[PDB]
Design a protein around this motif. Sequence first.
Motif, PDB file in Angstrom:
ATOM      1  N   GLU A  59      56.288  74.098  40.477  1.00 18.52           N
ATOM      2  CA  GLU A  59      57.350  73.129  40.709  1.00 18.52           C
ATOM      3  C   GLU A  59      56.935  71.705  40.364  1.00 18.52           C
TER       4      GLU A  59
ATOM      5  N   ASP B   5      54.907  69.464  41.758  1.00 21.35           N
ATOM      6  CA  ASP B   5      54.601  68.464  42.772  1.00 21.35           C
ATOM      7  C   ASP B   5      53.160  67.983  42.680  1.00 21.35           C
TER       8      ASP B   5
ATOM      9  N   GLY C 170      57.529  64.627  40.576  1.00 19.38           N
ATOM     10  CA  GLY C 170      58.044  65.973  40.712  1.00 19.38           C
ATOM     11  C   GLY C 170      58.401  66.681  39.424  1.00 19.38           C
TER      12      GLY C 170
ATOM     13  N   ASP D 245      61.441  70.181  35.164  1.00 15.04           N
ATOM     14  CA  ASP D 245      61.463  70.177  36.623  1.00 15.04           C
ATOM     15  C   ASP D 245      60.516  71.229  37.186  1.00 15.04           C
TER      16      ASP D 245
HETATM   17 CA   LIG Z   1      59.987  69.774  40.956  1.00 16.29          CA
END
Ligand SMILES: [Ca+2]
Length: 480
Positions: free
Chosen positions: A251, A253, A293, A473
């Motif tokens: 993801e 992060d 992110g 993303d």
């Molecule tokens: Ca993300």
Amino acid sequence: KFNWNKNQVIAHRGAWKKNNFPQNSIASLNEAVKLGCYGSEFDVWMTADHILVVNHDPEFQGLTIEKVNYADLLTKTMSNGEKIPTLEAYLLAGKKQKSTKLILEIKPSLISKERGIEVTNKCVEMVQKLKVTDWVEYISFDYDYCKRILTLLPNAKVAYLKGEVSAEQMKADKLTGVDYHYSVYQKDNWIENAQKLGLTVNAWTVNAVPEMQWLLAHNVDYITTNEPELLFDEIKKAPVAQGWKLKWADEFDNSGLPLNKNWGYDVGGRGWGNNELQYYTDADSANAIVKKGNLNIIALKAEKENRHYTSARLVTKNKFDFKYGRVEVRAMLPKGRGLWPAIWALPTDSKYGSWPKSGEIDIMEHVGFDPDSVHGTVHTEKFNHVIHTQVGKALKVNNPYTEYHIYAIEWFTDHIDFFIDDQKYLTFKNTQKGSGDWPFDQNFHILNLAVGGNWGGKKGVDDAIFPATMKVDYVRVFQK
Ligand SMILES: [Ca+2]
Ligand SMILES: [Ca+2]
């Protein structure tokens, strides 16, 4: 006896928003029961006369709940004509059904911890008094109230709302679940760590689709939401409803350079088989950086060895490979003529032979000079672009450079389906003729932003589009 619902929906203060019902009201609770939510959550305060009431803010309609008599609160009336419901009234109204659990939150006392400990004791007595221990599950910001609930009821459902205490210590004190804000869970493995130790996971203040999909992708137990009807729609759409279970996901992060656990670097500027103009750098934060992110693959108009452009090409090879499954990548494409961003998959072991014999899958391909088309393609020994026999399809994508889109493939034994925003635009079928027609047994994903090339460079390179950033993303891979 009971017929509990099995969904992950938890109605934050009831289903108040869509029908404009008051928050923490009987109409809000009944609307959550009608929708079929797993549970409805509410916040309890104690009046000065020790009458438990239901409200979120410490002051109800300008009246401080803890410092005023309960009779003073009845001067005020809600939008639908309701009076502030007592805990007994709320518990009794939910006692009349058996489909929706009751999530009770004890707000920390603005007076003293002792008074708030008394509220915790008063809540448990009334739950036992009305014989609704099977309905009530407890969440709280105060950790001592959570421990007090467990003392009076050893097997009560208790969850913590502050992210300070570790998951391992919560289980030590015999809590049953974690209920942190969804921003806390954006730390590698946190959701699946707590589940490993047997703790249920719940996230609150989740009102947006990308966060709901991200929570359902990692298979969180419950999602507290102010949009329960929207969450139900996304539950049916999520791949977990189709049997898909997440095996590997990034993801992003990470906030730095791409994780060495997930990605390798393709390095070199030797055309890469298509006479490409860029040099792919190795672990250079100028071309591959994870910030805010999202992974950032950036092509820069900068010299690198014998090339005028530098970029990045991240590969999952030798780190995560898979056969079959669903691959899901959400990305915002970089704008500009001459660019060639690509989301694709190559075989790891090349068991059938060198390219294109073992095959190739292109989940997403885009050329900068044609901004209305996104291409999905398969490459095989029999069907490839070198001999112009490859099979692929284009699909117009609206606003590809301004907003994220989800490019995905569903790879089965018999076929491969290509998706752009849950729309299937291409189906490549196994013709059962052998490896030449269907060469698929285990591949690996690749992320890159190419400049020029035999496809991307046909109209030249608008040298002003630089620096050009492709933002991804996440990358998720499901399997059945
Ligand atoms: Ca993300
Ligand atoms: Ca609440």
